[PDB]
Design a protein around this ligand. Structure first.
Ligand SMILES: [Zn+2]
Lengths: 146, 1093, 84, 96
């Protein structure tokens, strides 16, 4: 069971260094829509909140390293950054998820393609189509087969 | 007879009915009268011998009272529920969207026990919805019905199963209350008796007995007869009551600290204290009946008791050992046997009254907490009964029931039979019942206990198959909710006139004979052997002296809709089911015509449906008008009856009522005075009598297609009226109010021509598809007018308007409302469905000119052609027989009696020896015309106008081809058949689309009849396309036509510009998927066949 | 599994038998009777033997001493004196 | 060129791949502007990173019409281009 992974890394140029991240990609804005609702309220995908949290933790870690704080506080902030990135990628995978005001977990990046209405299952399910109609049938005995 | 105005429909029946068909709406009205404790119900109950009967509301108020403070210092009690007269009449409620209701008042008594002071006060409890004389409730002007719910009765149920691990036979028992914890006992594969309390973990049963106060000596004395009980007792690590109670408490309250008081009181609160556990009156009755306890004593308590538990244990042990008889100390001997769950001895009807009573109980429970609080938060001097009560929870609960409960349903007003069947419907699915999702075949299957109680034929064919049925015509509801049916008593081989209503449990203890069994003078059976039904649901030839009961009528088992199928016994069960279902979906016709061949049931069914107007008391007609009729009774008092004219039904069908009586006519009490939508002279008329020829014809009736004569279109034989209802309301918003007005911006001067000064289209205007109905504008102003939907058209028949300036009682945020009614008259057309009463449904494939139809030598062209190849395979020759009799009904008949009665006619009553043309006949479903009688009558038909016998003795005629003109080389079966126009009309069954509105959260089209939605393309259709290998068409369906936005705009403009449809490039789904994958730090790369790219 | 009754019964110690036949039962010790009673909760037994013939040291000296711990006063004694 | 879309490969992305995909680093946790509903500069919706919300409309307005293509505005860095680019342009965050 271990040689499976070890060989999967042996038999290719694939470096294992990709399993540790130094940078985090941000999905284009229109894939995570934010809009104002009727009456001045706002609708927003949870992805924006997760990205905001990650950015907050990263900026505060930079500040702490600038301030010369002792290692304990700095690496506690590092732990928080790690947790924020984990929540961004797969919120519920580890322990208890980050939850919104409704006491329900936020949807993460993985949920985009994980769920029953995920990207990989969109095409498979039946869908409505234009230029179509439906009607009752009767026998046209005078018709030709075509 | 019992119907003064009945037309003289001669009947082929041989046996007399010793019992009249009861009131078909009694299942609703009697239950509701019980709920409100009406005087009529009380008198009927005490006549039946019930001891001081109590009404439904009285029961709940007696349960509720006395409300007491937890200090014991005060009490509150409720009594004397009574109703004031209804605020408005039924028609006023329908007009103005009010609920038909009566104020409810209760006498409330408050007592201060510390002083002993008394205060009594009349308290208004709310407007209580009231049932109409038709068995319906007017809720917000809409007429609704409450269906009776089939549910398992509370009680003790024994069961037997096989242990798959050992193939051993195991027994178990469940005590199931109306409310409370469950109590199960069982004998397992290792021969030890155990108990499950509150569905917690299993224990030795003695652990309960010790917890109840039994010592080992008592357990040995009672249960010593069985070695397994002694082995369970001797292998139990419990010493006495306290240890057993603590052990029970641990399982019952895991993780909580156990103490003597906690366990001792918890075990009592579980089963023996009323506020947390109770068998309903029916549950107590059932437990006492099965366990043989409290016999000869009145049912006056609801809790389980020590004797019930001990007797249940002993019953289980006796059953396990294979014993058949059991008697308990202080009880009576009873049979030992497992219980069939599906038997109507265990199923019961929670009718309308009990359904309303439960929600009243919930609301009163809320109000009780209100009283518990505000009784203890006010000066004892100031508190009064009216200041302790808040009625809002009760009114809210009643409104919730009548507005949201699955069992409260819009009444099926398609036609009178549909509504009548809806009122008599029995539904197993609903709150606290079962569901279509997981109900197995076991509950759906017909049961031998259903005989005479639930119709085996009339049930839906879809996922509701078996879950919804109909009450039999002779059945009534036992006050405990069990269905009971009448039987004639039989003794010493002679039948007698005593009628006993037996439940299924009672009936299983008797032998019941077949009603059709012959009996000579004074009732003795002619033959020495008789068909009888037996407890196993079995049929046997028993000795004629071995019969205890007999069925009162041959058709005791059928429902109303099933009884209306002539020659029912000649049709297969599936096709009889289809015909019964189709009768309910027949649309009213402009003119109704009673069937030539019918049953005795049409008249009573129509009368009890209530669509016909019936005189209340004998008198003479003073006035007749299209709108109202006025009668003067022999008392000298005067009555006026109002007729519904062109009123819309819940399903859009026309509910026109017509007067039949002439001025000055003698009208007796109960006589029909005005016909309903589907009645002629009082008796129901759901279709038309058409001249039918049974033959294939040029392939235009291939695969059950139907050919119609153009006469039916020309003479409006099958024409029907439909009324559509459109709403638009003027409201307000943050940006201001909304205006209904004629001054719509930028609309052409003619488009608003038919509109009035307010902007509402005038009555009598012919409105086209897409035309304006009511002009409305809203701030931004904008055009938001009400317009005729796609495909719809007709004449504006009526307008109704509501404004807050008139105290309209509309909801919040609305300033005006307008309802427009559009009437459309539809002739029969191609694609419309027709069907007989035998399940012979079909679609009209062709309508032929009158000269093209095959015609009789007399010159009469046939009205309809039905293909032969349908009858033999589908097994519904009852349509053929009817056809033959139909001719014998149109042309008269005359049996020669000069020398003597012919042998085949020897069973005909003397009244059936001759009848004139167009004479209606009755052939009841299980006692009617035999084959020989029908053949003889075919031989005895009168000739036509010119003296020619058009149809031979075999029912065939020499038809002529209307096109070539030569006769057909063989005679063809010709006759008259009763045909129904079904509600599946083409006008709204057709859909079409080419782009339009789209979904937004995901971009696929919409789906809906009135929303211009497209057709679904499932995965199976994709499989078919892949099997063809038509890749490009599949791609069009998958991307351009369904999801793509840019692709859609491009392709539409390409078609409009007449240019090549662009060949799709990189899919749009792929590009979003790629970025979604990349956002998770996955390097996804497109590879060319030659290298990375 | 579709095993014979004997196959399924002999493989499991928890199997409870409907009847137990014991011949030469005098040789059974108290623990053997305990085991057999554990395997026959229904308490249906046909016990056959002759006390004088006992060879086992732990065998029964009298039927009561063995059977009263399980069915005191609920066991029937029969004898066959004639020898042929 | 879907005519050469023959195989699809998946693998671990390295930090250099993430930096090559991205048009710019998201620096601030800002949302759409509460004051005017415009995107914040350097926010998660920054136009300088992800492109303009409205076609050929410069952030500072020095280029505003269809005839202009591809030009970076020297004063605010937004590219005068079609708005659809906001559905494809990737960002990144540099972790400390
Ligand atoms: Zn600029």
């Amino acid at each position: 069971k271990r040689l499976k992974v070890v060989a999967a890394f042996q038999q290719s140029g694939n470096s294992p260094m990709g399993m540790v991240l130094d940078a985090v990609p941000v999905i284009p804005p229109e894939l995570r829509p934010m809009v104002q609702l009727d009456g001045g309220r706002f609708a927003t995908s949870d992805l924006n909140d997760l990205y905001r949290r990650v950015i907050n933790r990263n900026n505060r870690l930079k500040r702490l390293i600038d301030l010369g704080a002792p290692e304990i506080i700095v690496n506690n902030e590092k732990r928080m950054l790690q947790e924020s990135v984990d929540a961004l990628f797969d919120n519920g995978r580890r322990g208890r998820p980050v939850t919104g005001p409704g006491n329900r977990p936020l949807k993460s990046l993985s949920d985009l393609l994980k769920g029953k209405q995920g990207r990989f299952r969109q095409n498979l399910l039946g869908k409505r189509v234009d230029y179509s109609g439906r009607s009752v049938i009767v026998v046209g005995p005078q018709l030709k087969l075509h | 007879n019992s119907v003064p105005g009945a037309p003289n429909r001669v009947s082929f029946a041989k046996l007399r009915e010793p019992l009249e068909v009861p009131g078909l709406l009694d299942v609703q009205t009697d239950s509701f009268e019980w709920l409100v404790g009406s005087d009529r119900w009380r008198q009927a109950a005490i006549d039946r011998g019930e001891e001081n009967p109590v009404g439904g509301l009285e029961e709940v108020l007696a349960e509720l009272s006395p409300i007491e403070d937890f200090s014991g210092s005060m009490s509150l009690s409720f009594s004397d529920p009574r109703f004031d007269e209804v605020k408005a009449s039924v028609d006023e409620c329908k007009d103005k969207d009010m609920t038909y209701a009566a104020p409810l008042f209760v006498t409330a008594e408050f007592i201060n026990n510390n002083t002993g002071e008394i205060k009594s006060q009349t308290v208004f409890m709310g407007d209580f919805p009231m049932m109409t004389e038709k068995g319906t409730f007017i809720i917000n002007g809409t007429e609704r019905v409450v269906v009776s719910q089939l549910v398992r009765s509370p009680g003790v149920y024994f069961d037997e199963t096989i242990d798959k691990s050992t193939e051993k036979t195991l027994h178990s028992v469940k005590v199931i209350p109306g409310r409370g914890a469950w109590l199960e006992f069982d004998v397992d594969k290792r021969d030890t008796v155990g108990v499950r309390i509150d569905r917690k973990r299993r224990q030795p049963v003695t652990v309960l007995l010790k917890a109840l106060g039994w010592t080992n000596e008592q357990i040995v004395e009672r249960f010593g007869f069985s070695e397994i009980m002694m082995g369970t007792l001797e292998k139990d690590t419990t010493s006495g009551t306290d240890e057993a109670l603590l052990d029970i408490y641990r399982k019952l309250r895991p993780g909580e600290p156990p103490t003597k008081e906690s366990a001792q009181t918890l075990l009592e609160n579980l089963f023996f204290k009323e506020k947390r556990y109770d068998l309903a009156r029916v549950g107590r009755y059932k437990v006492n009946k099965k366990l043989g306890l409290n016999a000869g004593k009145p049912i006056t308590s609801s809790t389980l008791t020590e004797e019930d538990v001990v007797a249940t244990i002993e019953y289980l042990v006796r059953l396990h050992e294979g014993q058949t008889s059991m008697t308990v100390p202080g009880g009576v001997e009873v049979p030992v046997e497992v219980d069939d769950i599906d038997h109507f001895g265990n199923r019961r009807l929670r009718t309308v009254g009990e359904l309303i009573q439960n929600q009243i109980r919930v609301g009163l429970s809320r109000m009780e907490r209100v009283v518990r609080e505000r009784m203890t938060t006010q000066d004892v001097e100031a508190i009064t009964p009216q200041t302790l009560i808040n009625i809002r929870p009760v009114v809210a609960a009643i409104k919730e029931f009548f507005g949201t409960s699955q069992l409260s349903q819009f009444m099926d007003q398609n036609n009178p039979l549909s509504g009548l069947t809806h009122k008599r419907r029995l539904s197993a699915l609903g709150p606290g019942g079962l569901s279509r999702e997981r109900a197995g075949l076991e509950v759906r299957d017909v049961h031998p206990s259903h005989y005479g109680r639930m119709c085996p034929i009339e049930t839906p064919e879809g996922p509701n198959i078996g879950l919804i049925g109909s009450l039999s015509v002779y059945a009534r509801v036992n006050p405990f909710g069990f269905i009971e049916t009448p039987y004639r008593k039989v003794e010493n081989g002679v039948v007698t006139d005593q009628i006993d209503y037996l439940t299924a449990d009672e009936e299983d203890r008797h032998v019941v004979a077949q009603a059709n069994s012959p009996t000579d003078e004074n009732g003795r059976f002619t033959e020495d052997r008789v068909m009888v039904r037996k407890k196993g649901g079995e049929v046997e030839f028993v000795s004629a002296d071995q019969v205890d009961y007999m069925d009162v009528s041959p058709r005791q088992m059928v429902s109303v809709a099933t009884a209306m199928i002539p020659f029912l016994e000649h049709d297969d069960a599936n096709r009889a089911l289809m015909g019964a279902n189709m009768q309910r979906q027949a649309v009213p016709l402009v003119r109704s015509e009673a069937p030539l061949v019918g049953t005795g049931m049409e008249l009573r069914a129509a009368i009890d449906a209530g669509d016909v107007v019936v005189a209340d008391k004998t008198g003479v007609i003073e006035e007749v008008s299209a709108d109202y009729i006025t009668v003067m009774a022999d008392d000298g008092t005067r009555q006026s009856y109002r007729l519904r004219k062109f009123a819309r039904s819940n399903h859009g069908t026309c509910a026109n009522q017509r007067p039949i009586v002439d001025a000055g006519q003698r009208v007796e009490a109960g006589q029909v005075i005005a016909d309903g939508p589907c009645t002629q002279n009082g008796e129901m008329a759901l279709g038309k009598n058409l001249l039918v020829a049974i033959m294939p014809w040029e392939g235009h009736n291939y695969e059950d297609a139907i050919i119609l004569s153009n006469r039916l279109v020309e003479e409006d034989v099958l024409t029907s009226i439909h009324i559509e209802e459109h709403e638009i309301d003027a409201r307000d918003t943050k940006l201001g109010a909304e205006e209904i007005t004629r001054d719509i911006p930028n609309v052409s001067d003619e488009v608003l021509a038919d509109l009035d000064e307010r902007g509402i289209v005038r009555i009598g205007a012919e409105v086209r598809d897409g035309d304006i109905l009511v002009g409305k504008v809203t701030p931004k102003v904008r055009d938001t007018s009400l317009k005729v939907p796609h495909g719809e058209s007709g004449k504006v028949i009526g307008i109704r308007v509501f404004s807050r300036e008139d105290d309209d009682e509309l909801p919040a945020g609305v300033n005006e409302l307008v309802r427009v009614y559009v009437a459309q008259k539809r002739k029969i057309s191609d694609g419309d469905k027709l069907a007989g009463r035998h399940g012979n449904k079909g679609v009209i494939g062709k309508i032929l000119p009158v000269e093209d139809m095959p015609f009789l030598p007399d010159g009469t062209p046939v009205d309809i052609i039905l293909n032969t190849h349908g009858v033999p395979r589908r097994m519904n020759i009852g349509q053929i027989l009817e056809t033959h009799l139909g001719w014998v009904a149109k042309a008269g008949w005359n049996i020669d009696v000069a020398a003597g009665v012919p042998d085949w006619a020897s069973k005909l009553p003397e009244e059936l020896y001759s009848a004139p043309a167009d004479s209606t006949v009755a052939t009841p479903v299980f006692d009617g015309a035999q084959e020989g009688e029908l053949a003889g009558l075919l031989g005895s038909t009168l000739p036509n106008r010119d003296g020619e016998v058009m149809v031979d003795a075999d029912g065939k005629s020499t038809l002529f081809d209307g096109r070539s003109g030569e006769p057909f080389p063989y005679p063809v079966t010709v006759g008259y058949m009763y045909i129904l126009k079904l509600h599946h009309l083409v006008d709204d069954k057709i859909h079409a689309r080419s782009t339009g509105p789209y979904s937004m959260i995901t971009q696929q089209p919409l789906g809906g009849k009135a929303q211009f939605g497209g057709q679904r393309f499932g995965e199976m259709e994709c499989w078919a396309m892949q099997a063809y290998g038509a890749a490009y068409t599949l791609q069009e369906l998958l991307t351009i036509k369904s999801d793509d936005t840019v692709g859609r705009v491009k392709v539409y403009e390409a078609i409009v510009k007449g240019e090549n449809i662009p060949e799709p490039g990189i899919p749009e789904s792929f590009k979003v998927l790629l970025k979604e994958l990349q956002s998770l730090c996955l390097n996804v790369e497109v590879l060319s066949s030659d290298g990375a790219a | 599994d579709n095993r014979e009754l004997s196959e399924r019964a002999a493989a499991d110690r928890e199997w409870t038998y409907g009847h137990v036949v014991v011949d030469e039962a005098q040789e059974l010790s108290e623990m053997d009777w305990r085991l057999l009673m554990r395997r026959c909760p229904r308490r249906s037994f046909t016990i056959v033997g002759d006390l004088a013939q006992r060879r086992s040291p732990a065998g029964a000296r009298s039927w009561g001493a063995m059977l009263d711990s399980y069915v005191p006063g609920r066991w029937v004694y029969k004898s066959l004196s004639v020898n042929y | 060129d879907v005519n050469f879309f023959d195989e699809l490969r998946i693998g671990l992305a390295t930090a250099d791949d993430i930096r090559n995909w991205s048009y710019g680093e998201v620096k601030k946790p800002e949302t759409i502007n509460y004051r005017t509903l415009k995107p914040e500069k350097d926010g998660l919706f920054c136009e300088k990173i992800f492109g303009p919300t409205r076609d050929w409309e410069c952030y500072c307005g020095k280029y505003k019409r269809v005839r202009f293509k591809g030009i970076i505005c020297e004063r605010c860095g937004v590219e005068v281009t079609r708005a659809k680019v906001r559905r494809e342009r990737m960002g990144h965050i540099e972790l400390a």
